[PDB]
């Protein structure tokens, strides 16, 4: 009546070295392809083995201190070295839309089954750091998961949100805080330090438009946000910007004050806002917000309401989530907000009470 890890030691005295499958096919990987056992075999050996060890995290001790000194097992040096070349090949080129349907799901199933097992192996699996002592293709893995924004290219975004991309902003938050404490984070930071400078500048000018027209930029925006929103549960996003951009996400606020004059965008451009505010008001401050609530309160039929439109519209943006944005820092902050009395502003205040009404009672 033992428990797993204690029972393992009596087995090694017998047949211990090499018990999951060691000959995993490799050489017939030409440009041949098919939904034949060209995608089921290699991905059945992979999801079976990346599991027999993922679940073996409780017996995870005598199996990395002993599956890394397992040079003769021929398993690990194929599980890894292939899947890193194998993983890279799938990401590059996949090669009848139904044959590519089953192609994109069984590969999205391999990547994350590796990736959160990359979470497990990077955090509590190593008490002796047995893989940070040995990685032979630790570079290919970088070139894809960071495409957490351009991921609608390797896997589908509408086809991915079910099952996977419900689990995926999970895998990312699990993987980003996994290296962050490790000595392998500062290695990836150099890599990640690539998506903000090439984006800060183009997204800025490419958003102001009358109608829809430019639509391929309307998604990378939500992507620049989608991947940023998963980055607030990690590290480093606090390092890339407080350089001289502490009050810059406030210019992103002026960017919101920008599209006020031009006819309105409809109920779908309406949805974007965290990037508009949830992304900016999670690294930037909340006082320069109040300083815009009441500070922007400073200011035949057509030019009449324009006096009353930076008087009408500013209030409208200020609503929805911006009122709940107060809740994150509002203890103590409102006695300052409520003391200033430009005009009765307490009107918008009950907007705070309303969303509290909603959650509780």
Coordinates of C-alpha atoms in Angstrom, one line a residue, residues 4-204:
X4 CA 3.1 5.8 -7.2
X5 CA 6.5 7.5 -6.7
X6 CA 7.5 5.1 -4.0
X7 CA 6.3 2.1 -6.0
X8 CA 8.3 3.2 -9.1
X9 CA 11.6 2.3 -7.5
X10 CA 10.8 -1.4 -7.2
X11 CA 10.0 -1.6 -10.9
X12 CA 13.4 -0.1 -12.1
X13 CA 15.1 -3.0 -10.4
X14 CA 13.3 -5.0 -13.0
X15 CA 12.4 -3.5 -16.4
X16 CA 12.6 0.3 -15.9
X17 CA 14.6 2.1 -18.6
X18 CA 12.2 2.7 -21.5
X19 CA 8.6 1.7 -21.2
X20 CA 6.6 4.3 -23.3
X21 CA 7.1 3.9 -27.0
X22 CA 10.6 4.7 -28.3
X23 CA 10.6 4.2 -32.1
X24 CA 8.5 7.1 -33.3
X25 CA 8.4 7.4 -37.0
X26 CA 10.4 10.2 -38.7
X27 CA 12.0 9.7 -42.1
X28 CA 8.9 9.3 -44.4
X29 CA 8.1 13.0 -43.7
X30 CA 8.6 14.2 -47.3
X31 CA 6.4 16.6 -49.2
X32 CA 3.9 13.8 -49.5
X33 CA 1.1 14.6 -47.0
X34 CA -2.6 13.5 -46.9
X35 CA -5.2 12.9 -44.3
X36 CA -3.8 9.3 -44.5
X37 CA -1.9 8.1 -41.4
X38 CA 0.3 11.1 -42.2
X39 CA -1.4 13.2 -39.5
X40 CA -2.9 10.5 -37.2
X41 CA 0.2 8.5 -36.5
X42 CA 2.7 11.1 -35.6
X43 CA 0.0 13.0 -33.7
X44 CA -1.2 9.9 -31.9
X45 CA 2.3 9.0 -30.7
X46 CA 2.7 12.7 -29.6
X47 CA -0.6 13.3 -27.7
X48 CA -0.2 9.9 -26.0
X49 CA 3.3 10.6 -24.8
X50 CA 3.0 14.3 -24.0
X51 CA 0.2 13.1 -21.7
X52 CA 1.7 10.1 -20.0
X53 CA 4.2 12.6 -18.7
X54 CA 1.9 15.6 -18.2
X55 CA -0.3 13.5 -15.9
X56 CA 2.9 12.0 -14.5
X57 CA 3.7 15.3 -12.7
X58 CA 3.1 13.6 -9.3
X59 CA 5.6 11.0 -10.3
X60 CA 7.4 13.9 -11.9
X61 CA 10.5 13.5 -9.7
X62 CA 12.2 10.3 -10.8
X63 CA 11.4 11.2 -14.4
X64 CA 13.3 14.3 -15.3
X65 CA 16.1 13.7 -12.9
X66 CA 15.9 10.3 -14.5
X67 CA 14.3 11.0 -17.9
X68 CA 17.2 13.4 -18.6
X69 CA 19.9 10.9 -17.6
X70 CA 18.0 8.6 -19.9
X71 CA 20.3 8.9 -22.8
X72 CA 19.6 5.3 -23.9
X73 CA 15.8 5.6 -23.7
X74 CA 15.8 7.1 -27.3
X75 CA 12.4 8.5 -26.3
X76 CA 13.2 12.0 -25.0
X77 CA 15.7 12.8 -27.8
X78 CA 13.0 12.0 -30.3
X79 CA 10.0 13.4 -28.4
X80 CA 11.8 16.7 -28.1
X81 CA 14.1 17.0 -31.2
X82 CA 11.3 15.9 -33.6
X83 CA 8.5 17.9 -32.0
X84 CA 10.8 21.0 -32.2
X85 CA 11.6 20.3 -35.8
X86 CA 8.2 18.7 -36.2
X87 CA 6.5 21.6 -34.4
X88 CA 8.3 24.0 -36.7
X89 CA 7.3 22.2 -39.8
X90 CA 3.6 22.3 -38.9
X91 CA 3.8 26.0 -38.2
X92 CA 5.5 26.8 -41.5
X93 CA 3.6 24.9 -44.2
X94 CA 0.6 22.7 -43.6
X95 CA 1.2 20.6 -46.8
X96 CA -10.1 20.3 -50.7
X97 CA -10.9 22.4 -47.6
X98 CA -12.1 19.3 -45.6
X99 CA -8.6 17.7 -45.6
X100 CA -7.2 21.0 -44.3
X101 CA -10.0 21.2 -41.7
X102 CA -8.7 18.0 -39.9
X103 CA -5.2 19.3 -40.6
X104 CA -5.6 22.5 -38.6
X105 CA -7.4 20.9 -35.6
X106 CA -5.1 18.0 -34.9
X107 CA -2.1 20.3 -35.1
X108 CA -3.7 23.0 -32.8
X109 CA -4.2 20.0 -30.5
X110 CA -0.5 19.1 -30.6
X111 CA 0.8 22.6 -29.9
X112 CA -1.1 23.3 -26.7
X113 CA -0.7 19.8 -25.4
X114 CA 3.0 20.6 -25.6
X115 CA 2.7 24.2 -24.5
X116 CA 0.9 23.8 -21.2
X117 CA 3.2 20.8 -20.6
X118 CA 5.8 23.5 -21.2
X119 CA 4.1 25.3 -18.3
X120 CA 4.3 22.2 -16.1
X121 CA 7.9 21.4 -17.0
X122 CA 9.0 25.0 -16.4
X123 CA 7.5 25.6 -12.9
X124 CA 7.1 22.8 -10.3
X125 CA 8.3 19.9 -12.3
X126 CA 12.0 21.1 -12.0
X127 CA 13.3 21.1 -8.4
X128 CA 16.7 20.5 -9.9
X129 CA 16.4 22.3 -13.2
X130 CA 17.2 19.3 -15.4
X131 CA 16.1 20.8 -18.7
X132 CA 17.5 24.3 -18.3
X133 CA 20.7 22.2 -18.3
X134 CA 19.9 20.9 -21.8
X135 CA 17.9 22.3 -24.6
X136 CA 18.9 21.6 -28.2
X137 CA 16.3 23.5 -30.3
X138 CA 14.9 25.8 -27.6
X139 CA 14.8 28.5 -30.3
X140 CA 12.1 27.1 -32.8
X141 CA 9.5 27.2 -30.0
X142 CA 9.9 30.9 -29.7
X143 CA 9.0 31.5 -33.4
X144 CA 5.3 30.6 -33.0
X145 CA 3.7 30.8 -29.5
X146 CA 4.7 34.5 -29.5
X147 CA 2.6 34.7 -32.6
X148 CA -0.2 34.8 -30.0
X149 CA -1.5 37.7 -32.0
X150 CA -0.9 36.5 -35.6
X151 CA -2.3 33.1 -34.4
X152 CA -5.3 33.5 -36.7
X153 CA -2.8 32.4 -39.3
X154 CA -1.4 29.1 -38.0
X155 CA -4.8 28.1 -36.5
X156 CA -8.2 29.6 -37.2
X157 CA -9.6 32.3 -34.9
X158 CA -13.3 31.4 -35.3
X159 CA -12.6 27.7 -35.4
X160 CA -10.1 28.0 -32.5
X161 CA -12.2 29.8 -29.9
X162 CA -14.2 26.6 -29.1
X163 CA -12.1 24.1 -27.1
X164 CA -8.7 25.6 -27.8
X165 CA -8.9 29.4 -27.5
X166 CA -11.0 29.0 -24.5
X167 CA -8.1 27.0 -23.1
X168 CA -5.5 29.2 -24.9
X169 CA -5.5 32.6 -23.1
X170 CA -5.3 30.1 -20.3
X171 CA -2.2 28.3 -21.6
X172 CA -0.6 31.7 -22.3
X173 CA -1.2 33.1 -18.8
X174 CA 0.1 29.7 -17.6
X175 CA 3.2 29.8 -19.8
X176 CA 4.1 33.5 -19.4
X177 CA 4.2 33.5 -15.6
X178 CA 5.9 30.1 -15.9
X179 CA 9.2 31.4 -17.4
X180 CA 8.8 34.8 -15.7
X181 CA 10.1 33.5 -12.4
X182 CA 12.5 31.2 -14.2
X183 CA 16.0 32.0 -15.6
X184 CA 14.5 31.5 -19.0
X185 CA 12.3 34.6 -19.0
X186 CA 15.0 37.2 -19.4
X187 CA 15.9 35.1 -22.5
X188 CA 12.5 35.5 -24.1
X189 CA 12.2 39.2 -23.2
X190 CA 14.8 40.0 -25.8
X191 CA 12.5 38.1 -28.2
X192 CA 9.2 39.6 -27.2
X193 CA 10.7 43.1 -27.3
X194 CA 9.7 43.2 -31.0
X195 CA 5.9 43.5 -31.2
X196 CA 5.3 47.0 -29.6
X197 CA 7.6 49.3 -31.7
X198 CA 6.5 47.9 -35.0
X199 CA 2.8 48.2 -33.8
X200 CA 2.8 51.5 -31.8
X201 CA 3.4 53.5 -34.9
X202 CA 1.3 51.9 -37.7
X203 CA -1.9 51.2 -35.7
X204 CA -1.8 54.8 -34.6

